[PDB]
């Protein structure tokens, strides 16, 4: 029971961590873009002074 | 597969707000200069009656 | 024993080529990858000059 | 400001456009931690890797 | 001649595939890509010449 | 034996995380530095006509 | 009166056109972050780097 | 060896961004002031027609 | 053999460690100098205010 217990534990979370990483990859396009425009937005604010 | 189609579909339609804000300002501010240019045309008409 | 061995395939040029199976997969796939592989710089070159 | 230049402001964007995408792509390689990401980026490396 | 990956890189690109084929003479795939990069290299020369 | 293949496997594929990270940073921020430089020049270009 | 006035704006027109250029070449160089950008700019530098 | 060479050749081509802007600072305003000044020529003759 | 192998093993890492250290020290010049360029242009942001 303990032996099987780990068998699905380790795999299931090896996944949940790993397929999360692909989300991180796509999360990066968001981060880059949101960073980019926010910096751009602040640049527009620099003109508003 | 689902992850990638999402990306692909976005890439087809993607626009950057920075460029749009950037280009807008030039289009914006160039268009304003055109307004001043047009107002100059009014100032041309203003001068016909010296 | 076969899975170790260089097995022969009769090809579209008729050729009887001696290969492992997954190596065949590699020749087929890598060759296809080579298509876009070269084109990358090639298109960029035309991209660059056109700009 | 007729054959070469006017694109400059237009292209200043395209300069950014190309750079930002590539850098994102490179950041992904860093995030991936791999030298390459596509079969055709270096197939010889990729195929022997296979 | 301006840090371009065209002629300057393209010639050296052959030697890389050449080197890979030298490192993996067994691997016919190198021959294919090596030759493919070759005919790619000459065409660039041919096109610029034309 | 397998560990060597894994070692070779790792040697072949994994990027130099540090070198690329800072090299990417190297190119990236200089690109970003240029990005603002482009923006400022827009204001600097557009202001003169008043 | 006409003539001496005529000369003056014609020069400023040229002077106006000169400045916008000077401003740009700085910009493109900033885009690169490099001293120079074309073979003829310093054939020694570029072609040596070859 | 190659690493050292990479650094050395980089010294040959690379440039800082700061001065280019600092140089841009003086010209850009002088560019405007010159343009602003040139206008006055019209206004002086303008105030004459009064 | 183990100790001989162990010594050889260690050899690959001190070299590997050193070799990047050569790069790590190299990068530090860019890290400080180039970010300073970033800090300057940030100082230019502060100047624009």
From Swiss-Prot, chains A, I:
It comes from the Bacteria. It is found in: Secreted; Bacterial flagellum. Residues 21-48 form a coiled coil. Belongs to the FliD family. Required for the morphogenesis and for the elongation of the flagellar filament by facilitating polymerization of the flagellin monomers at the tip of growing filament. Forms a capping structure, which prevents flagellin subunits (transported through the central channel of the flagellum) from leaking out without polymerization at the distal end. Homopentamer. This is Flagellar hook-associated protein 2. It comes from Campylobacter jejuni subsp. jejuni serotype O:2 (strain ATCC 700819 / NCTC 11168). The lineage of its organism: Bacteria, Pseudomonadati, Campylobacterota, Epsilonproteobacteria, Campylobacterales.
């Amino acid at each position: 029971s303990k032996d099987s217990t780990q068998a699905m534990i380790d795999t299931r979370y090896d996944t949940m961590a790993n397929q999360w990483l692909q989300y991180e990859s796509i999360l990066n396009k968001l981060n880059q873009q949101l960073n980019t425009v926010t910096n751009m937005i602040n640049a527009a604010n620099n003109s508003n002074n | 597969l689902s992850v990638n189609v999402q990306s692909i579909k976005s890439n087809v339609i993607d626009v950057d707000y920075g460029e749009a804000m950037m280009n807008l300002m030039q289009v914006q501010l160039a268009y304003q200069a055109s307004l001043k240019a047009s107002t100059t045309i009014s100032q041309l008409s203003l001068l016909n009656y010296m | 024993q076969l899975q170790y061995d260089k097995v022969n395939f009769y090809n579209e040029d008729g050729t009887i080529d001696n290969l492992t199976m997954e190596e065949y997969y590699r020749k087929l796939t890598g060759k296809i990858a080579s298509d876009g592989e070269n084109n990358n710089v090639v298109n960029s070159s035309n991209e660059t000059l056109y700009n | 400001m007729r054959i070469t230049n006017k694109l400059n402001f237009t292209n200043s964007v395209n300069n950014s456009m190309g750079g930002q995408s590539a850098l994102y792509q490179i950041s992904q390689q860093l995030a991936s931690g791999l030298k390459i990401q596509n079969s055709y980026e270096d197939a010889s490396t990729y195929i022997d890797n296979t | 001649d301006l840090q371009n990956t065209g002629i300057l890189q393209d010639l050296e690109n052959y030697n890389k595939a050449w080197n890979d084929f030298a490192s993996n003479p067994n691997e016919n795939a190198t021959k294919i890509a090596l030759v493919k990069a070759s005919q790619t290299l000459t065409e660039s020369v041919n096109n610029t010449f034309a």
